[PDB]
Amino acid sequence: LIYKGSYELQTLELNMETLNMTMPLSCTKNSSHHYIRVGNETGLELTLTNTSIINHKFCNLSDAHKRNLYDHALMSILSTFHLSIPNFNQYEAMSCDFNGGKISVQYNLSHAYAVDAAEHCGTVANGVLQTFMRMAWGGSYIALDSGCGNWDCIMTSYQYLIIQNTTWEDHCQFSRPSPIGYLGLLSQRTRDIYIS
Amino acid sequence: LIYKGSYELQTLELNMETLNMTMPLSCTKNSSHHYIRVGNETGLELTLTNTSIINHKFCNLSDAHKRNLYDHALMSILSTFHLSIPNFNQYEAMSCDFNGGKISVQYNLSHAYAVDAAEHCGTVANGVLQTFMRMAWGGSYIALDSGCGNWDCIMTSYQYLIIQNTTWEDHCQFSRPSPIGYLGLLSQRTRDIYIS
Amino acid sequence: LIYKGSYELQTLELNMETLNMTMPLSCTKNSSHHYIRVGNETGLELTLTNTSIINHKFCNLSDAHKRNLYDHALMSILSTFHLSIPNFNQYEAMSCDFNGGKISVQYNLSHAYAVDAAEHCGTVANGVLQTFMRMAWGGSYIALDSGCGNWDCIMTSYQYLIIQNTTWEDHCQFSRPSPIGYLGLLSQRTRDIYIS
Amino acid sequence: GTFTWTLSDSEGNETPGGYCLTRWMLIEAELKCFGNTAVAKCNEKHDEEFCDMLRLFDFNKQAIQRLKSPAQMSIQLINKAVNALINDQLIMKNHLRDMMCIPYCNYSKYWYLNHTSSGRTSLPKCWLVSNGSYLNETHFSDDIEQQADNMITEMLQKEYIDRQG
Amino acid sequence: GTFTWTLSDSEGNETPGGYCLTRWMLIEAELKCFGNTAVAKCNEKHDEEFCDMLRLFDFNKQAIQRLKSPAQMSIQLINKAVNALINDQLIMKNHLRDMMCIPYCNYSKYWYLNHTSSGRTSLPKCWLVSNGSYLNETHFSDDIEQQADNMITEMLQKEYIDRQG
Amino acid sequence: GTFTWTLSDSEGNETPGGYCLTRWMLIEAELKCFGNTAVAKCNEKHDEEFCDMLRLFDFNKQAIQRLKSPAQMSIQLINKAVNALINDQLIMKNHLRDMMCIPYCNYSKYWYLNHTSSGRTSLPKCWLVSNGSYLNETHFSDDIEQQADNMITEMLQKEYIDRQG
Ligand SMILES: *[C@@H]1O[C@H](CO)[C@@H](O[C@@H]2O[C@H](CO)[C@@H](O[C@@H]3O[C@H](CO[C@H]4O[C@H](CO)[C@@H](O)[C@H](O[C@H]5O[C@H](CO)[C@@H](O)[C@H](O)[C@@H]5O)[C@@H]4O)[C@@H](O)[C@H](O[C@H]4O[C@H](CO)[C@@H](O)[C@H](O)[C@@H]4O[C@H]4O[C@H](CO)[C@@H](O)[C@H](O)[C@@H]4O)[C@@H]3O)[C@H](O)[C@H]2NC(C)=O)[C@H](O)[C@H]1NC(C)=O
Ligand SMILES: *[C@@H]1O[C@H](CO)[C@@H](O[C@@H]2O[C@H](CO)[C@@H](O[C@@H]3O[C@H](CO[C@H]4O[C@H](CO)[C@@H](O)[C@H](O[C@H]5O[C@H](CO)[C@@H](O)[C@H](O)[C@@H]5O)[C@@H]4O)[C@@H](O)[C@H](O[C@H]4O[C@H](CO)[C@@H](O)[C@H](O)[C@@H]4O[C@H]4O[C@H](CO)[C@@H](O)[C@H](O)[C@@H]4O)[C@@H]3O)[C@H](O)[C@H]2NC(C)=O)[C@H](O)[C@H]1NC(C)=O
Ligand SMILES: *[C@@H]1O[C@H](CO)[C@@H](O[C@@H]2O[C@H](CO)[C@@H](O[C@@H]3O[C@H](CO[C@H]4O[C@H](CO)[C@@H](O)[C@H](O[C@H]5O[C@H](CO)[C@@H](O)[C@H](O)[C@@H]5O)[C@@H]4O)[C@@H](O)[C@H](O[C@H]4O[C@H](CO)[C@@H](O)[C@H](O)[C@@H]4O[C@H]4O[C@H](CO)[C@@H](O)[C@H](O)[C@@H]4O)[C@@H]3O)[C@H](O)[C@H]2NC(C)=O)[C@H](O)[C@H]1NC(C)=O
Ligand SMILES: *[C@@H]1O[C@H](CO)[C@@H](O[C@@H]2O[C@H](CO)[C@@H](O[C@@H]3O[C@H](CO[C@H]4O[C@H](CO)[C@@H](O)[C@H](O)[C@@H]4O)[C@@H](O)[C@H](O[C@H]4O[C@H](CO)[C@@H](O)[C@H](O)[C@@H]4O)[C@@H]3O)[C@H](O)[C@H]2NC(C)=O)[C@H](O)[C@H]1NC(C)=O
Ligand SMILES: *[C@@H]1O[C@H](CO)[C@@H](O[C@@H]2O[C@H](CO)[C@@H](O[C@@H]3O[C@H](CO[C@H]4O[C@H](CO)[C@@H](O)[C@H](O)[C@@H]4O)[C@@H](O)[C@H](O[C@H]4O[C@H](CO)[C@@H](O)[C@H](O)[C@@H]4O)[C@@H]3O)[C@H](O)[C@H]2NC(C)=O)[C@H](O)[C@H]1NC(C)=O
Ligand SMILES: *[C@@H]1O[C@H](CO)[C@@H](O[C@@H]2O[C@H](CO)[C@@H](O[C@@H]3O[C@H](CO)[C@@H](O)[C@H](O)[C@@H]3O)[C@H](O)[C@H]2NC(C)=O)[C@H](O)[C@H]1NC(C)=O
Ligand SMILES: *[C@@H]1O[C@H](CO)[C@@H](O[C@@H]2O[C@H](CO)[C@@H](O[C@@H]3O[C@H](CO)[C@@H](O)[C@H](O)[C@@H]3O)[C@H](O)[C@H]2NC(C)=O)[C@H](O)[C@H]1NC(C)=O
Ligand SMILES: *[C@@H]1O[C@H](CO)[C@@H](O[C@@H]2O[C@H](CO)[C@@H](O[C@@H]3O[C@H](CO)[C@@H](O)[C@H](O)[C@@H]3O)[C@H](O)[C@H]2NC(C)=O)[C@H](O)[C@H]1NC(C)=O
Ligand SMILES: *[C@@H]1O[C@H](CO)[C@@H](O[C@@H]2O[C@H](CO)[C@@H](O[C@@H]3O[C@H](CO)[C@@H](O)[C@H](O)[C@@H]3O)[C@H](O)[C@H]2NC(C)=O)[C@H](O)[C@H]1NC(C)=O
Ligand SMILES: *[C@@H]1O[C@H](CO)[C@@H](O[C@@H]2O[C@H](CO)[C@@H](O[C@@H]3O[C@H](CO)[C@@H](O)[C@H](O)[C@@H]3O)[C@H](O)[C@H]2NC(C)=O)[C@H](O)[C@H]1NC(C)=O
Ligand SMILES: *[C@@H]1O[C@H](CO)[C@@H](O[C@@H]2O[C@H](CO)[C@@H](O[C@@H]3O[C@H](CO)[C@@H](O)[C@H](O)[C@@H]3O)[C@H](O)[C@H]2NC(C)=O)[C@H](O)[C@H]1NC(C)=O
Ligand SMILES: *[C@@H]1O[C@H](CO)[C@@H](O[C@@H]2O[C@H](CO)[C@@H](O)[C@H](O)[C@H]2NC(C)=O)[C@H](O)[C@H]1NC(C)=O
């Protein structure tokens, strides 16, 4: 407790919720449910599941923009997420449907029967999980089957990552809110592409 | 004047024109006329007007490059400007015509009858003005109808932004020349795009 | 040797080869042969020659990705190299053929009869040499006909730059291995494009 | 005035010194005030997690008091402002440490030394986490001991020159 | 030699010290010379508007004396050189301050303190502007007073240790 | 513990101090150890070529001892890690100097001063090259002399305050 003479060790813990009107805040409820607050009233829900909700592959992105019915904050976040997924060319893995400006995005990952493998390093499933790990950094560690991997060969038991617009309800029982995940993604984004 | 003891407050003002052979310099003549020196002899004129000069929408960019008749410094600046305009997908707003390598670029902004509104935040007109504000930073403040907005919902009375190649004639009666506008744009550029 | 009192000038030279398992290392054998180690066993050979090896222009990049038969480290390096070539739109200058995942890339430069000229500043040949100069920085200086140019108007006697996958054989007789060339390219990459 | 970091945008200070953290900045424990001597370290120190949080909090305050006019939804300001608010290098260091099972800062908890004989406090340092939890006080013992030495050293240097003339 | 900032590329200095600003760098007032002690602060200080202007001016000089051969139109060099010449973070801070009606630096005018008893001068600081004009000397009074204290402190510290042995 | 630069990720130090360079880090000359006083300068100094090499070497070690599991081919880690390991601004300065026929650092060779009366050594500085070779010791004479003065100054300051109480 007391170091050297009379220097007492003291602590402080920060309340990052007061930053919700200027910055989005990520938090975790449990291993399959992660959230982003994007303002005082609303946010995004990120779910790791075994059930698809989108059964087509149109992903009507250009039409969402022409119609302009979506919330812009939510769209900026989705763009940041997507742009940062390294080496994503496999568009058949992504499906979205902005019906009425509603946001619903699904990433279908090839979480194959990798009982004992380190092959699934060069795949889409890894690229999507990497972005996820950063967005929910600090709570995302319980979402994976593995531990201290290099995040460049990580796997989970779940097959789909579904991102949807929600109403904020303070679902942060596992990890506290923090702006770091998003800010740390904005700073780099599109630095993993292949043209040669 | 004299602080504490004998410390006299002194000043210096910098002459940034001596930097014209290495860096472009932006300055302002009045609210509708802004300029960029791009070398010792030539530059660009940026005019905020109510009169269009281009009455078509071809914007023959790829042909300008195949022909290669344009000055490269001027083209690099135009590219930087354009690339930095956030969320620009609305190509019908832009028209250009590089006839003989001449540079003439027009941005047609939807400066609607926004007598009392804060709707024109998510529009093209705002995205173009934002880039403008930075390029002519330090003089651009008189170009707008509004004051300390967040530059993410600003409007002007003018409908077109026209950029043309000119001969440098020292048209800097409102604000002094400075390399900062351009350098401060080069440093960031393409950091506002939407794919999701 | 001894400065002021008893301060002796001492030196150290670093062995950067021990970094080969974490970072690629560039080195030079002679003026026409430059190498990149990309791991403990393999690397890339970069040759400046007067003989083409690819006599077509298909450059089957998208098929290389669909097949996924290539080494990923080698491909990441090729992407970085290519992306960093400024103003490259002249795709007819590039040809590649990833037969079986093998890497063979050829850049055909217009090294015209520039006996006495400073015209070849705005060309492809210069853009490709610029990237080359950085990748083999520290040894690349002997690859050029000219000296302290601004690397924005440099020429060589050679017409082709050929990049191929090799086996590492310690071909570093002219300049020592160093990670700097590559790291210094990763940091900037795609900062020279024209859209206007 | 005193600070050159983001706070300086509007002078700030809040009080004569210490750039006090209010009860809504902290989780419990009401208010905490530091000395200008420690807070001012953020004027020069770039790579420090505590200083970055102060920069973000002060930004949030300024962005609410001022410029509250743009439909009260300028949540996008940060997309550019961030370049001037935080050191993303720190974020990368913490991500790398996480990948390697190296204790890392998740930015929620900080520790500092408080000289009970004066009220002088150090700039807070991040309490690190590893394997889902916080590290024990027995870890960091070298860092805690060094901060205590640093505080002692500054007190002595100040008196050697400024107390004694 | 003395400086580590851009000037160091070719040693620079110009004179035995002070990295003198010539009559074409300034608007009126002929020449101004600073002390090495103040100029050298730019060796460590990254986020300072005055230091960035010095970096750009020295670059411009070097890019004219040397490497004048590329058709005398290497106006594009700066597109890459800028990364090594200025702190774009400062530019962002000044843009943010502008948006919020916070006085900001537009880089044209600087102030410094000149000790009339010695000729020792401080490193210049940016004179700020707000609402289309320059702020009055009554503003900044805290900053001017602090710079005067800082100059006093350095003079004293130098004598305490180096004058007295 | 002592260092805050990359080394701090796993405390490091290697020995009680000096962050010793092993025989495989150097070309010949077996081992070299520095003092904590000099190595620690990299805690604050960002734009120094020697410090960046130390950051890369320590990273390489950590990335081999730990996290050796990802098929032993995580050669791609650096594509992101680099942002937290080196100052790319230095790389740009050296490229600019090369273009202008200004001696530049190619990162292979460094020099330092060694006080033969104590074993105290300075942080190494880059030996520069120009026109395909290394510069002579007659060049840099101003820089070598300044480093010798700096070492003298630190020795004196330490004794003035800490030896004498
Ligand atoms: C950096 O790393 C550190 C180290 O991991 C992270 O620190 C952790 O952060 C979390 C999130 O804040 C802390 O969780 C909180 O723990 C409280 C105490 O839990 C225990 O006691 C209570 C007593 O009632 C038991 O009920 C609990 O057991 C139940 O909950 C756990 C949850 O994990 C389940 O696993 C169990 O099976 C039980 O179901 C524990 O024994 C806990 O009370 C608190 O939960 C409330 O608050 C949250 C957030 O506001 C609400 O979402 C939640 O619904 C609860 O809210 C109700 O109750 C409060 C009571 O005060 C009312 O005020 C509300 O209105 C409402 O009615 C939460 O689970 C965790 O303790 C902490 N770990 C350590 C070691 O410190 C940092 O977050 C991380 N930083 C970042 C940025 O990532
Ligand atoms: C950071 O912010 C600060 C704060 O705003 C900016 O500071 C301002 O910068 C401008 C631009 O340099 C300064 O403007 C100059 O003011 C001179 C004085 O003007 C007054 O006196 C003259 C006396 O003759 C009157 O004629 C003027 O009135 C007329 O002009 C104003 C212009 O705004 C009109 O509004 C009026 O209606 C009148 O028409 C004023 O009463 C002024 O002389 C000077 O103009 C000459 O120089 C410029 C630039 O070289 C020429 O373009 C212009 O044509 C003039 O040149 C002729 O005259 C000179 C005489 O010396 C000859 O040498 C030439 O060859 C030629 O014949 C200019 O308008 C402004 O004063 C200053 N404000 C403050 C508070 O300090 C910084 O710029 C900004 N920094 C950055 C980077 O943005
Ligand atoms: C920053 O800038 C500086 C300044 O330019 C660069 O410094 C240079 O770096 C190079 C590369 O390491 C140094 O080259 C080495 O020089 C050795 C000595 O050469 C002289 O003596 C030998 C005696 O046998 C002669 O044979 C040589 O002549 C022959 O080689 C030269 C090569 O350029 C030809 O031009 C001649 O025509 C001759 O053919 C010279 O007179 C030299 O021994 C060494 O070569 C061996 O090592 C390399 C690398 O490992 C092998 O690739 C090569 O095949 C040789 O290896 C055989 O021999 C060794 C013997 O020890 C065995 O151990 C091996 O197993 C194998 O059998 C190499 O050429 C150069 O001296 C140095 N310049 C200065 C001024 O210091 C920095 O690199 C640069 N930094 C960066 C990052 O770019
Ligand atoms: C998401 O982010 C927002 C932004 O930070 C947070 O909202 C802030 O919450 C705090 C705490 O509730 C607010 O501060 C308090 O405001 C009370 C109301 O008066 C203010 O607001 C009215 C307009 O509604 C103004 O006219 C008035 O002038 C004030 O500005 C004050 O009464 C409070 O002071 C008194 O009570 C407190 C105890 O609650 C005592 O400690 C005080 O000493 C005093 O007696 C206090 O000032 C703050 O104003 C809110 N900001 C905004 C912009 O609305 C959200 O809380 C956050 N979400 C979560 C979950 O934290
Ligand atoms: C756009 O940017 C350019 C680049 O900075 C500026 O051009 C510089 O302008 C200054 C001031 O006029 C020049 O400096 C002066 O040059 C005179 C001419 O001699 C030089 O040039 C010839 C070749 O033309 C060389 O052979 C010779 O060796 C010199 O290098 C000198 O005579 C001047 O010195 C004398 O007169 C001045 C008063 O004018 C006195 O103060 C001196 O003490 C001395 O008696 C002086 O050296 C500089 O050379 C120009 N640079 C270039 C590259 O040409 C432009 O001015 C700028 N645009 C604007 C509007 O500012
Ligand atoms: C996720 O976002 C969608 C919107 O894309 C939310 O559902 C829909 O939200 C709109 C408002 O944006 C509701 O419109 C309402 O229409 C009535 C007239 O019929 C009008 O009186 C109301 O004032 C309002 O404009 C729409 O009804 C609503 N859809 C449904 C089925 O209720 C959705 O709720 C968001 N998801 C979550 C979890 O919050
Ligand atoms: C998410 O991606 C997986 C693949 O990683 C998809 O599963 C695959 O679906 C195809 C059909 O589209 C299966 O092929 C064949 O289908 C016919 C029925 O049409 C069946 O009779 C054949 O025997 C065969 O199964 C393929 O085997 C299956 N792959 C695996 C590993 O099961 C999945 O449908 C995608 N989910 C969504 C929502 O898009
Ligand atoms: C904006 O740029 C255009 C060029 O794109 C400038 O107009 C034209 O400039 C060219 C030179 O680039 C002039 O060419 C001349 O041709 C005669 C032969 O007919 C030759 O003897 C000259 O040496 C030169 O090569 C062209 O005549 C000129 N166009 C006109 C109508 O005069 C334009 O002036 C620039 N705008 C401003 C305001 O400076
Ligand atoms: C710049 O953009 C504005 C729109 O923001 C353009 O003005 C719009 O022009 C269309 C015609 O292309 C007008 O629609 C209709 O035109 C017919 C004539 O063909 C007329 O009989 C109809 O009554 C109707 O006006 C549209 O109303 C008009 N919008 C506004 C707000 O006035 C403008 O032409 C563009 N400028 C350039 C140079 O492209
Ligand atoms: C440059 O890369 C190519 C590969 O793209 C290297 O050539 C080929 O490498 C593959 C292995 O990647 C060899 O495959 C072998 O097949 C036999 C069965 O026939 C199997 O038993 C072996 O274990 C192995 O899988 C392939 O034979 C080889 N091609 C030739 C003609 O030998 C090429 O060698 C690399 N270049 C350099 C200079 O190293
Ligand atoms: C690399 O690029 C150069 C151009 O910079 C290519 O050389 C050019 O090749 C064309 C033919 O494709 C030559 O045009 C004509 O070809 C016919 C034969 O089909 C001949 O009868 C005509 O007299 C004429 O030569 C063109 O002149 C030639 N350019 C030069 C400067 O020699 C070269 O083939 C490209 N290399 C590769 C591997 O693609
Ligand atoms: C914005 O933040 C305020 C609090 O700062 C929220 O206020 C709550 O509103 C509900 C009614 O919808 C009341 O029952 C609560 O008591 C209020 N909370 C407090 C602390 O007073 C508000 O709901 C938030 N969202 C919006 C859209 O304004």
Side-chain angles (χ1 to χ4, degrees), chain E residues 134-148:
Chain E
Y134 285 112
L135 299 177
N136 262 60
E137 295 82 0
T138 65
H139 294 288
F140 314 114
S141 67
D142 289 345
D143 294 291
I144 296 167
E145 287 279 301
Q146 289 177 337
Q147 289 299 313

Side-chain angles (χ1 to χ4, degrees), chain A residues 1-24 37-40 71-74 76-77 80 133-134 137-141 147-152 174-189, chain D residues 21 24-27 32 34 50 53 56-57 59-60 63-64 72 74-76 78-79 82-83 86 88 91-92 94-95 98-102 104-117 124 127 131-134 137 141 144-146 148-149 151-152 155:
Chain A
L1 178 62
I2 306 301
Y3 294 83
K4 300 288 178 169
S6 58
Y7 295 93
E8 185 176 359
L9 185 67
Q10 294 288 315
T11 63
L12 70 150
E13 190 179 9
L14 300 174
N15 186 347
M16 296 181 199
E17 288 189 315
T18 60
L19 300 176
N20 70 77
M21 291 178 70
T22 300
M23 284 158 270
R37 185 170 190 163
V38 301
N40 179 31
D71 183 83
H72 288 188
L74 294 174
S76 293
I77 293 167
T80 299
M133 285 297 291
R134 290 192 296 274
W137 186 59
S140 65
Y141 74 92
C148 295
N150 61 347
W151 298 354
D152 208 39
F174 181 76
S175 66
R176 293 191 187 281
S178 172
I180 297 299
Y182 181 76
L183 294 173
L185 189 63
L186 288 173
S187 66
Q188 299 299 313
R189 288 177 172 161
Chain D
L21 310 180
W24 298 277
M25 291 173 69
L26 303 175
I27 299 171
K32 294 183 185 290
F34 292 84
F50 183 73
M53 290 306 302
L56 292 175
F57 276 100
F59 175 74
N60 182 57
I64 295 170
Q72 296 79 58
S74 58
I75 198 71
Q76 298 293 296
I78 196 66
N79 287 340
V82 67
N83 292 335
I86 63 170
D88 60 310
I91 293 170
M92 284 299 300
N94 286 309
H95 287 181
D98 188 2
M99 288 188 282
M100 293 180 180
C101 281
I102 296 172
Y104 66 90
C105 180
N106 78 359
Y107 300 87
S108 294
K109 183 174 187 176
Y110 302 84
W111 60 270
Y112 60 97
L113 292 171
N114 187 317
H115 190 220
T116 66
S117 298
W127 195 299
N131 201 45
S133 190
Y134 285 112
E137 295 82 0
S141 67
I144 296 167
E145 287 279 301
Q146 289 177 338
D149 284 341
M151 292 176 78
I152 293 166
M155 291 174 195

Side-chain angles (χ1 to χ4, degrees), chain C residues 69 99-103 165-167:
Chain C
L69 303 176
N99 186 356
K102 182 173 71 174
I103 295 171
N165 74 261
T166 191
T167 296

Side-chain angles (χ1 to χ4, degrees), chain C residues 27-96:
Chain C
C27 69
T28 297
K29 181 176 173 65
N30 63 46
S31 65
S32 63
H33 289 266
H34 304 263
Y35 299 87
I36 302 168
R37 185 169 190 163
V38 301
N40 179 31
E41 185 176 3
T42 65
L44 296 170
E45 179 174 62
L46 291 90
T47 300
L48 300 174
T49 189
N50 254 339
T51 300
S52 64
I53 63 171
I54 301 172
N55 293 285
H56 62 75
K57 297 187 185 300
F58 290 106
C59 196
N60 293 76
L61 294 168
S62 66
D63 294 285
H65 288 298
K66 288 185 290 187
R67 291 194 298 269
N68 196 32
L69 303 176
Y70 57 84
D71 183 82
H72 288 188
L74 294 174
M75 186 61 75
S76 293
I77 293 167
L78 292 173
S79 180
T80 299
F81 179 87
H82 187 77
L83 291 171
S84 76
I85 297 168
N87 199 30
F88 189 85
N89 297 287
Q90 295 86 334
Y91 281 95
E92 63 273 13
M94 179 178 187
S95 181
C96 63

Side-chain angles (χ1 to χ4, degrees), chain A residues 58-107:
Chain A
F58 290 106
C59 196
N60 293 76
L61 294 168
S62 66
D63 294 285
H65 288 297
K66 288 186 290 187
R67 291 194 298 269
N68 197 32
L69 303 176
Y70 57 84
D71 183 83
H72 288 188
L74 294 174
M75 186 61 75
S76 293
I77 293 167
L78 292 173
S79 179
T80 299
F81 179 87
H82 187 77
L83 291 171
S84 76
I85 297 168
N87 199 30
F88 189 85
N89 297 287
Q90 295 86 334
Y91 281 95
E92 63 273 13
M94 179 178 187
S95 181
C96 63
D97 188 346
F98 300 97
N99 186 356
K102 183 173 71 174
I103 295 171
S104 181
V105 179
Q106 178 179 290
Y107 291 89

